[PDB]
Amino acid sequence: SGFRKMAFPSGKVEGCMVQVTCGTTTLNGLWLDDVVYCPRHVICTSEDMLNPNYEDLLIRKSNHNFLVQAGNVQLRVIGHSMQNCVLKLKVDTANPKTPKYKFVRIQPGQTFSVLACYNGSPSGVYQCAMRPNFTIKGSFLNGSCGSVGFNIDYDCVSFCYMHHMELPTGVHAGTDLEGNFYGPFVDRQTAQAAGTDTTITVNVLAWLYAAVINGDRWFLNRFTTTLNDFNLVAMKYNYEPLTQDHVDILGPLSAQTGIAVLDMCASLKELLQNGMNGRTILGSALLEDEFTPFDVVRQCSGVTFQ
């Protein structure tokens, strides 16, 4: 037993990571088949990022202005194109390490693993949730752009995130692999507001079920509630409203533990109104919302990948 924030094994994504340089800007690219994907602001100087015209900046670039390096090996660039906020660099060599993969646009509340990279080289791996306000709370230093987020299902890597920006508030923003930003963000160094950062209610509930499965039971109360009455409390505490879809997804955890979803809702409501009184739940002193219901089942069942 025990319960930990876990990232997916990252070996499949390590084999795809390259370094992309244009002029004096260097960041990370993702090399799948004969295409390298990277943030389009590889073509930007520090000054350009204040207010870039990406079309006009890219006009000045040719294939040979893009240096793509994998280890100590130069990939030859035979074509380039801008898709929303990503560049796609056609290279003359397919990555022999390409895994079975997909591109997916994930929903708010879903989670994924980030392989933090610098100069094309892997540095570490950690788990992230796409917040309801479409930011992520990550660990990204200068040169980490082009790092990707992904999920693994058996032998298939589902890429869902590419890192582009740190907001002046210290949280992080990026795109799917088609270059479309999550949230209302743009790849420009200007002040950008993410709205209210609400809590992923269905995720908090799955984590409470994981706690019960692992023996943390103290917070189990003897109240129940209703969806509408719980959501009254949830809105007060800036929690996402719980819907029957969310109840449905929690079904298996409800079944395994014998705790009706609305009973857990009443327990969470009490935690929201009373705090934790100096106690912890699965080693944490606040309510954790970056575990999905599938994350819980995955870890309480030991799913493997090949």
Next chain:
Amino acid sequence: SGFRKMAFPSGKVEGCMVQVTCGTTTLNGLWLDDVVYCPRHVICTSEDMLNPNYEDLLIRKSNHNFLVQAGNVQLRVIGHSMQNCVLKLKVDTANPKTPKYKFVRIQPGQTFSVLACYNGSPSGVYQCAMRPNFTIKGSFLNGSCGSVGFNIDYDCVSFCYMHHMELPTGVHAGTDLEGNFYGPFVDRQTAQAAGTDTTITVNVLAWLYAAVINGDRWFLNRFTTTLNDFNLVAMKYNYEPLTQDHVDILGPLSAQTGIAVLDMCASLKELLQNGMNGRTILGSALLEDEFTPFDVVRQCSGVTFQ
């Protein structure tokens, strides 16, 4: 910026993971050069684990009683031997995926990444500290035995942990790669006490420095203290005593932030005596002690591995 619990990229260790079966017991092995390392209780039935005589049990086993499988490929076992609590299985094929590696026995308080495995297959990766009482708080289900813990420095993997046991208290115990248990534990299903689980004081201090580097500054007080007076408080709260070696290791973080180590000690003492009053530090509502001073510097500097 931002600060996250980060595991090392796990691709090098994934390439070494195999499945080992003996009779009806299956667990994980580590395949480096022409040797497979796995916990010796692969030779045990459920009944045997109550009180095993490993020498007498192993006498009954021959090379062919050990099935070692890598993917869909059978490795031929040409020799076996027991080193403390690990078996070493000589195979007739060197792992072509073997990285540069070392075996190291880490010290209490140091950290490492665990690649949780089942049936020889990677399931996820997470960061762990060797607690002062020589347990780890992990996520290990049945069949996770033989999973390893490691650190990566450039192109060299330093294996430091192999998982063997869950204690009846729910924490975890295992060996170095020479088969020697961390702590006073034995590979037997009998009740085993780990002593008092104290807090890794130097680690908490490094994390407070990481907080300051990232803008979390509220806890900075205007007291200082002395090593002896701080340790008076530290013993009351079951904190490891702070030594000048620990002060020395914090030197660079002290230098970068301008906060003398004993000043941070006075801030921690106030947190210990007053709590956090409903606030958080780097997104946590308790004091985190599973980041080493090197973990902080690594993440605030962006060290890469190849």
